[PDB]
Amino acid sequence: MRLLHTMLRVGDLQRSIDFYTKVLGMKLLRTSENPEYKYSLAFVGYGPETEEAVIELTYNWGVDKYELGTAYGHIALSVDNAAEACEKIRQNGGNVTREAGPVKGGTTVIAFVEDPDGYKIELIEEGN
Amino acid sequence: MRLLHTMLRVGDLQRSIDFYTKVLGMKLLRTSENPEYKYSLAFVGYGPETEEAVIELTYNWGVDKYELGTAYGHIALSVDNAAEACEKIRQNGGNVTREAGPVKGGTTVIAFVEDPDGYKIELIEEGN
């Protein structure tokens, strides 16, 4: 068995697609639209659905806002360079909440940012 | 780059661990405690963190309830036997919101359930 995807509702489909693909480096794996239930989907990831877990972006026709709540935490992604990513994100529809830096009591470099919908994302970095 | 994990806040750590492991077939990959900030973490998944995305469960000491909100969708997992999983879940602290059956307009068997904290989970009976 395996983790297939994490589904998040977004206020603007293309807006989210752009962020995940152009800013985070994922690829648009597939999209679909359902007239009966009035929604469109976009699957984004760093590999094919058959190979990895991805993110399912759900757009409900005419719904541009949701309540984030306090239960949902975040999604964590690995990055080659957290500082660079942070910069790219802050200038491309996102928001940096926790600047790139080692975790207290550790050496692992991390950062926290938000996507265009406010969803939290954790960046974890993989002799200058 | 890769998807590391999805973090969810839970009202009872062990209860959650029990569900994901004993009911969903996941394994307890690792745990940690943070006395300073008063929280405990647990990582559960189907394989090593190094190779795949997992789930991170967070328990904040003394916090047994959160506000789910309307943004967060769910997590979809592949299942060996959807029907069987529903039963196990049914009689093991969970709720079956969508009985196992072929998807609308398809044949692929799917189901929907809720974990102990109300999180929605989609079960999908799914080079070489």
- For residue B121, CA distances in Å to B35, B74, B112 come to 31, 5, 6
Q: Out of A7, A75, A119, name the one closest to residue B74 (CB).
A: A7
∠ Cα A57 B22 B39 (to 5°)? 70
A73 and B3: CB-CB below 8 Å? no
State the total domains in chain B. 1
Q: Which two tokens stand for residue A111?
A: 């950062």
CATH at residue A56: 3.10.180.10
Please give, rounded to a whole number of angstroms, the shortest distance from the CA of B122 to a CA of chain A. Answer: 9
Cβ separation B71–A5 shorter than 8 A: no
**Amino acid at site B39:** Y
Cβ contact (<8 Å) for A67 and B66? no
Q: Which of B75, B77, B93, B74 is nearest to B22 (CA)?
A: B93
**CB contacts, 8 Å: A69 with chain B:** 66-72
Burial A33-53 (b: 16+ CB within 10 A, else e): eeeeeebbebbbbbeeeeebb
Tokens of B59: 């328990």
**Amino acid found at B127:** G
Residues of each annotated binding site of A for Ni(2+): 5, 56, 74, 122
Contact: A9, B71; criterion CB under 8 Å: yes
By C-alpha distance, which of A35, A47, A65 is closest to A4? A47
- Hey, what are A69's tokens? 């709540």
Q: What's the resolution in A?
A: 1.7
Method: X-ray
- Domain of B13? 1-128
**What phi, psi does B6 have (nearest 5°)?**
-115, 125
Kindly list the distances between the CA atom of residue B73 and the CA atoms of A107, B29, B30, in Å, as whole numbers in the listed order: 33, 24, 25
Does B122 belong to an annotated binding site?
Answer: yes
Non-local CB neighbours of B86 within 8 Å, separated by 6+ positions: B96, B99, B100, B111, B113, B123
- Nearest C-alpha neighbor of A71 from the set B70, B27, B19, B13: B70
Find residues 35-64 of chain B whose CB sits inside 8 Å of chain A: 45-47, 52-56, 58
3-state secondary structure B44-111: EECCCCCCCCEEEEEEECCCCCCCCCCCEEEEEEECCCHHHHHHHHHCCCCEEEEEEEECCCCCCEEE
The answer to whether the beta carbons of residues A20 and A55 sit under 8 Å apart is: yes
Residue A69: Cβ within 10 Å count? 14
